[PDB]
Design an enzyme around this catalytic site. Structure first.
Site, PDB file in Angstrom:
ATOM      1  N   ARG A   1       0.836  -1.238  -0.086  1.00 16.73           N
ATOM      2  CA  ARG A   1       0.024  -0.039   0.122  1.00 16.73           C
ATOM      3  C   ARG A   1       0.828   1.454  -0.066  1.00 16.73           C
ATOM      4  O   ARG A   1       2.117   1.266   0.633  1.00 16.73           O
ATOM      5  CB  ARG A   1      -0.935   0.058   1.335  1.00 16.73           C
ATOM      6  CG  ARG A   1      -2.244  -1.067   1.244  1.00 16.73           C
ATOM      7  CD  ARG A   1      -3.170  -0.840   2.247  1.00 16.73           C
ATOM      8  NE  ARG A   1      -3.985  -1.895   2.306  1.00 16.73           N
ATOM      9  CZ  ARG A   1      -3.647  -3.161   2.769  1.00 16.73           C
ATOM     10  NH1 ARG A   1      -2.251  -3.503   3.088  1.00 16.73           N
ATOM     11  NH2 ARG A   1      -4.662  -4.115   2.897  1.00 16.73           N
ATOM     12  N   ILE A   2       0.229   2.345  -0.468  1.00 18.23           N
ATOM     13  CA  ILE A   2       1.229   3.664  -0.547  1.00 18.23           C
ATOM     14  C   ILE A   2       0.221   4.634  -0.017  1.00 18.23           C
ATOM     15  O   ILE A   2      -0.812   5.140  -0.572  1.00 18.23           O
ATOM     16  CB  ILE A   2       1.285   3.730  -2.068  1.00 18.23           C
ATOM     17  CG1 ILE A   2       2.159   2.794  -2.679  1.00 18.23           C
ATOM     18  CG2 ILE A   2       1.786   5.478  -2.304  1.00 18.23           C
ATOM     19  CD1 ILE A   2       1.633   2.163  -3.376  1.00 18.23           C
ATOM     20  N   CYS A   3       0.502   5.142   1.356  1.00 21.80           N
ATOM     21  CA  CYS A   3      -0.137   6.045   1.989  1.00 21.80           C
ATOM     22  C   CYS A   3       0.486   7.049   1.550  1.00 21.80           C
ATOM     23  O   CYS A   3       1.467   7.960   2.406  1.00 21.80           O
ATOM     24  CB  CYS A   3      -0.071   5.919   3.529  1.00 21.80           C
ATOM     25  SG  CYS A   3      -0.506   7.199   4.683  1.00 21.80           S
ATOM     26  N   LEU A   4       0.158   7.828   0.287  1.00 14.59           N
ATOM     27  CA  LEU A   4       0.722   9.085  -0.246  1.00 14.59           C
ATOM     28  C   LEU A   4      -0.527  10.046  -0.437  1.00 14.59           C
ATOM     29  O   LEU A   4      -1.557   9.331  -1.075  1.00 14.59           O
ATOM     30  CB  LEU A   4       1.472   8.734  -1.540  1.00 14.59           C
ATOM     31  CG  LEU A   4       2.135   9.964  -2.001  1.00 14.59           C
ATOM     32  CD1 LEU A   4       3.529  10.478  -1.005  1.00 14.59           C
ATOM     33  CD2 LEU A   4       2.832   9.415  -3.366  1.00 14.59           C
TER      34      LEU A   4
END
Lengths: 153, 584, 318
Positions: free
Chosen positions: A84-87
């Protein structure tokens, strides 16, 4: 529709002049998703690793953001085990900062940047984040082990 | 102001139902409401949260679940209050949101919030009581996925049977100036057992208990959703003896209107609520021994009703203040003031018992067991057609189920009472005669309220009139299928007028004549009205003390406003009343 | 280390949990840190166990609670947890904040006061608990002497207002005063501090600030909010005209200010009256220096409400 409008240009663009250390093609297994490959950035433990990623285009995409995942897993503070990419750029307004002036190449450049500079402020992995915060060489060691274990041929 | 608010929120509900989409994008003002909630009443707050909840929990827009967070914030803040004013509000919001998100992270959010709510509610007694209450309400109203319910109900039953259920020891420990006893058990359950309940040691330790009734309600509803209607591990609670002091009417314990009079009146009030809850619980069940146990509990309830209105006539000041938590508690924070408002209001299926046929002990189900059921239906239908659980039900379905459970079922009770009072007048002990007289008074009161229902002014209920007044014509003769309205009126009134040999008292006489009036308005025919009101004015009406207290003033005022008007020559009828007024 | 406390709490209170609490005296910090690191539900379970096994009738649990309060205060801001755990912690603390005396909550107030003044508060979410503490202080009749809890609350809030705030954290500062029971001078000093804070602000920040200032103005404090906004934007437009001697941005601001002031007087049929009374040049007839372009623009955006319309349009005429 505008989905396909963005897609038809970004396809040829990322095929011909992709970002540095980044490539992407129409996922030869999916043909609706995309297969990206970020080459292990220099001055990182992720060197000697070609990190594969799945890229999902929602149907309203210039308006929605994309949805990326690390298929090749990564030992990162901000990238979890799943990839996942928490961006913010993959998030909508005031929560995030997505707008159509950005695109697949821009967000992949942001991910390549993150791979060299982990964010200590927005951690998916709080323990890897504390390790990167205090014990730098242990984090770098585990990351290089993770790279040579999975990302290497 | 009030109506504005009310209507408006009705509308908003209609609007979200009409189109959630467009509303979604003006949601922001809706969220922006939340800074102004000083001026709202909780009933209005209920719908408001219903709104915002149903808004938030549209799966197509979870990106702007910002409102979910905002709601959880305000939940938190109004919960976090010493003051009941905000705490109740939060509670309500929370529970509503819960029911609404109820269509596995869904279940995790659910249980998290729920246990949070429970923890917030626990220490304040009315809070936890309300919590159970509205949870029970949510569960009966919504068929939601039973995961948090099978999770909670196995803990609720254990906490219940450790908080209240105690071994059947007659006197527990504690300093009591009151002889504690395992009293009012139905006595088919063996007294020397485990299942019995602690009341007076709890209420004296107060100076858990108050919420007992709704807590049992939630227990009932969770086990009724798990086992699907079975009360197999609760039959002991139907018939266990209760840890009560001597509930003998304390006329010797007079000149004693101190805090101990408050203890006794509140104690009788709470056990009354308890038995009201029990009869609400075991009504729908069909087992005949459990029905007969419910009969014994109905007579226990009317016994404790007469005991409590005595104990409040003892001192008229000592209010045992416990109203229902929906509408009554906000107005704050003689027997009739508590009869409907204070006491727990009962369930519409409670009248599955009065189907049974009358018995007579003066002449030869009980007559007093039926008196309590009919007295319950009387206050219930005058409340509704003129109560938390019943207000959610529309008055049309109330009069509908009344047409089935009363009119073809209590025709036999009215006929047995005609045979009773015919035999009583032939003979002419007394308490059986007067309980039958008051049973008949309540029967005709229920009939009056049934057929004074303004819904029959509307055209769709005339089919229910053509069924009801046809089943009344059926009492004189059957086969007159598809009759005229006026002929069915004539048959129904010819059936009901013949009981003018049986009517013992005058309150029953005025309920019977005004019942004839309200059925006769549907229709020349003024001769039957004038002659029959004159027959009732001219009959004896034997003069018991309460039987002539039933000849109250405004009652005769209504009877004579009917007779002197509808009699054809009003002025010659006045000349007759004047001619007969001199020789008195 | 946790499962023993779970088993102690499984049955009963203050008979074995207290006894075990008198075994492990320190190391609650690192305990809770590995707790939030591994799973936050265990931290919530521990907190429930702690608050049941550490009642505040006995004064040893009061200090365990004060220590763990400061622990959660520092970690929730600094230690970046998950969101749901953070919300849970905050809710639990706001729940058990009621079971304290005066002075312990007064020193917690002084903790937060010194912290927001100087402490670089990383997230500021901890402030959500603060007004709960002010509420418990106001309501607790366990009298102090330095005096009532409500008066020590007045003292602490006067301290906070007279003190300096963060640039970032004025939103949440006023969001706290949103739900407090306040009086005239309470709300007055709140708005006066938030008012003087305007001179150190980006302009995209002002709209929701003024929104919250006004929903708080709703209590009693109407006049001064508008008078200050007026004088502010008056001097602003004068300074901008002297620069002419970000125009589009400046316009975009003024508009949304007026929009939100419209909703305000829409909800308050008195706000506009004081607005008018503040502005009416015809006290006798001499020109006041109160009016302005922005002032007038507000009036004309207001006249489309049905009540004030003709009143305003007469005023402007005369």
């Amino acid at each position: 529709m505008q989905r396909a409008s963005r897609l038809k240009r970004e396809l040829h663009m990322l095929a011909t002049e992709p970002p540095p250390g980044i490539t992407c093609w129409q996922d030869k297994d999916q043909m609706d998703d995309l297969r990206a490959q970020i080459l292990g950035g220099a001055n990182t433990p992720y060197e000697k690793g070609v990190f594969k990623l799945e890229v999902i285009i929602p149907e309203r995409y210039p308006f929605e953001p994309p949805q990326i995942r690390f298929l090749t897993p990564i030992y990162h503070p901000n990238i979890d085990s799943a990839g996942r990419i928490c961006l913010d750029v993959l998030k909508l307004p005031p929560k995030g900062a997505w707008r159509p002036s950005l695109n697949i190449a821009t967000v992949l450049t942001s991910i390549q940047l993150l791979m060299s500079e982990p964010n200590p402020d927005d951690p998916l992995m709080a323990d890897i984040s504390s390790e990167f915060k205090y014990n730098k060489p242990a984090f770098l060691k585990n990351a290089r082990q993770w790279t040579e274990k999975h990302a290497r041929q | 102001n009030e109506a504005e608010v009310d209507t408006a929120l009705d509308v908003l509900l209609e609007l979200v139902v009409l189109n959630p989409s467009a509303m979604m994008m003006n949601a922001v003002f809706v969220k922006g409401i939340l800074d102004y909630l000083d001026n709202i009443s909780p009933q209005q707050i209920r719908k408001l949260f219903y709104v915002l909840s149903t808004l938030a929990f549209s799966k197509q827009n979870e990106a702007s679940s910002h409102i979910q967070d905002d709601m959880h914030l305000v939940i938190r803040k109004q919960l976090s209050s010493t003051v009941f004013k905000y705490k109740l509000i939060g509670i309500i919001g929370a529970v509503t949101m819960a029911g609404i998100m109820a269509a596995d992270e869904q279940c995790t959010q659910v249980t998290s919030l729920l246990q949070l709510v429970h923890s917030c509610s626990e220490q304040s007694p009315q809070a936890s009581a309300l919590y159970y209450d509205e949870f029970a309400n949510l569960i009966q109203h919504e068929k939601l996925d039973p995961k948090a319910l099978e999770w909670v109900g196995h803990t609720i039953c254990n906490d219940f049977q450790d908080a209240f259920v105690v071994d059947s020891c007659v006197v527990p420990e504690g300093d009591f100036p009151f002889p504690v006893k395992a009293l009012y058990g139905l006595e088919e359950y063996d007294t020397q057992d485990g299942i019995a309940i602690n009341l007076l040691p709890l209420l004296f330790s107060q100076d858990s208990p108050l919420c007992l009734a709704p807590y049992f309600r939630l227990l009932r509803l969770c086990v009724e959703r798990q086992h699907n209607g079975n009360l197999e591990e609760i039959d002991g609670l139907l018939d266990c003896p209760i840890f009560l002091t001597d509930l003998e009417p304390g006329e010797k314990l007079e000149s004693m209107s101190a805090k101990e009079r408050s203890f006794m009146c509140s104690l009788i009030f709470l056990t009354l609520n308890w038995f009201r809850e029990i009869v609400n619980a075991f009504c729908q069940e069909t087992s005949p021994e459990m029905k007969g146990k419910v009969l014994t509990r109905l007579k226990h309830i009317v016994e404790l009703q007469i005991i409590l209105e005595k104990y409040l006539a003892v001192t008229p000041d000592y209010v045992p203040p416990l109203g229902n938590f929906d509408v009554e508690t906000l107005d704050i924070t003689l027997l009739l003031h508590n009869s409907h408002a204070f006491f727990r209001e009962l369930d519409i299926e409670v009248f599955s018992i009065l189907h049974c046929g009358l018995v007579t002990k003066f002449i030869l189900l009980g007559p007093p067991e039926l008196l309590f059921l009919l007295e319950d239906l009387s206050q219930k239908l005058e409340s509704m057609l003129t109560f938390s659980h019943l207000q959610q039900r529309s008055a049309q379905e109330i009069v509908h189920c009344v047409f089935q459970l009363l009119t073809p079922m209590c025709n036999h009770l009215e006929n047995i009472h005609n045979y009773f009072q015919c035999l009583a007048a032939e003979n002419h002990k007394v308490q059986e005669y007067h309980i039958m007289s008051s049973c008949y008074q309540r029967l005709l009161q229920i009939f009056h309220g049934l057929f004074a229902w303004s819904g029959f002014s509307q055209p769709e209920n005339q089919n229910l009139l053509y069924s009801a007044l046809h089943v009344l014509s059926s009492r004189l003769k059957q086969g007159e299928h598809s009759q005229p309205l006026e002929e069915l009126l004539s048959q129904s009134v010819h059936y009901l007028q013949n009981f003018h040999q049986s009517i013992p008292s005058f309150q029953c006489a005025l309920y019977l004549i005004r019942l004839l009036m309200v059925i006769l308005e549907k229709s020349q025919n003024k001769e039957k009205i004038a002659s029959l009101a004159r027959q009732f004015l001219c009959r004896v009406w034997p003069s018991g003390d309460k039987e002539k207290s039933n000849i109250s003033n405004d009652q005769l005022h209504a009877l004579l406003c009917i007779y002197l008007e509808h009699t054809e020559s009003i002025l010659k009828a006045i000349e007759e009343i004047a001619g007969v007024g001199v020789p008195e | 280390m946790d499962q023993k406390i779970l088993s102690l709490a499984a049955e009963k209170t203050a008979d074995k949990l207290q006894e075990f609490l008198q075994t492990l005296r320190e190391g609650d910090l690192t305990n809770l840190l590995q707790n939030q690191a591994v799973k936050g539900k265990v931290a919530g379970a521990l907190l429930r166990a702690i608050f049941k096994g550490s009642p505040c009738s006995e004064e040893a649990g009061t200090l365990r609670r004060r220590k763990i309060y400061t622990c959660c205060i520092q970690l929730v801001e600094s230690g970046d947890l998950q969101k749901e755990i953070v919300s849970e912690i905050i809710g639990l603390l706001m729940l058990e904040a009621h079971h304290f005396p005066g002075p312990l909550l007064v020193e917690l107030a002084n903790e937060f006061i010194s912290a927001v003044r100087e402490g670089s508060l990383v997230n500021g979410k901890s402030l959500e608990l603060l007004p709960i503490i002010l509420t418990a202080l106001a309501t607790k009749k366990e009298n102090l002497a330095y005096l009532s809890g409500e008066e020590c609350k007045k003292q602490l809030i006067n301290t906070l207002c007279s003190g300096r705030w963060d640039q970032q954290y004025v939103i949440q500062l006023t969001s706290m005063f949103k739900d407090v029971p306040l009086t005239a001078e309470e709300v007055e000093f709140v708005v006066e501090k938030a008012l003087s804070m305007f001179s150190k602000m980006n302009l995209q920040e002002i709209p929701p600030l003024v929104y919250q200032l006004l929903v708080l103005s709703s209590k009693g404090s109407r006049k001064s909010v508008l008078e200050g906004i007026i004088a502010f934007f008056s001097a602003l437009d004068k300074q901008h005209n002297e620069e002419q001697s970000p125009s589009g941005e400046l316009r975009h601001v003024e508009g949304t200010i007026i929009l939100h002031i419209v909703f305000a007087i829409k909800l308050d049929y008195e706000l506009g009256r004081e607005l008018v009374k503040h502005l009416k040049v015809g006290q006798q007839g001499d020109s006041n220096n109160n009016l302005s372009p922005f002032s007038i623009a507000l009036l004309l955006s207001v006249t489309r409400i049905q009540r004030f319309q003709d009143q305003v349009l007469d005023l402007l005429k005369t």
